[PDB]
Design a protein around this ligand. Structure first.
Ligand SMILES: [Zn+2]
Ligand SMILES: [Zn+2]
Ligand SMILES: [Zn+2]
Length: 87
DNA sequence: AGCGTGGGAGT
DNA sequence: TACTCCCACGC
């Protein structure tokens, strides 16, 4: 992992330069990505994308359990729900 | 429950 | 560099 973070007291290292640059927004507070509906800004474009569903109500992730109609905005919410049904 | 926001990864 | 994804932790 040659891409080391030189910020004060940070010991993180990464194998990819883009992982380091993304990480460094934690230290600087930079939030490049802005929601066009509510104007909130975010550190990461993928988190802007899932945030925008709070406004649209879209829930593309459907439970696969027979006779369950529950749906979710994000994949990990569905993971948690499937775990709940039986594990 | 719903969602902010990291790391690691694939493309 | 760009993008999103899964997985994860946390509140
Ligand atoms: Zn750092
Ligand atoms: Zn918004
Ligand atoms: Zn279900």
């Amino acid at each position: 992992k040659p891409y080391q973070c030189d910020f004060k007291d940070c010991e993180r290292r990464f194998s990819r330069s883009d992982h380091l640059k993304r990480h460094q927004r934690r230290h600087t507070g930079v939030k490049p990505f802005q929601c066009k509906t509510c104007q909130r800004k975010f550190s990461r474009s993928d988190h802007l994308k899932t945030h925008t569903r709070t406004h649209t109500g879209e829930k593309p992730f459907s439970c696969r359990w027979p006779s369950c109609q529950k749906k979710f905005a994000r994949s990990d919410e569905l993971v948690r729900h499937h775990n709940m049904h039986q594990r």
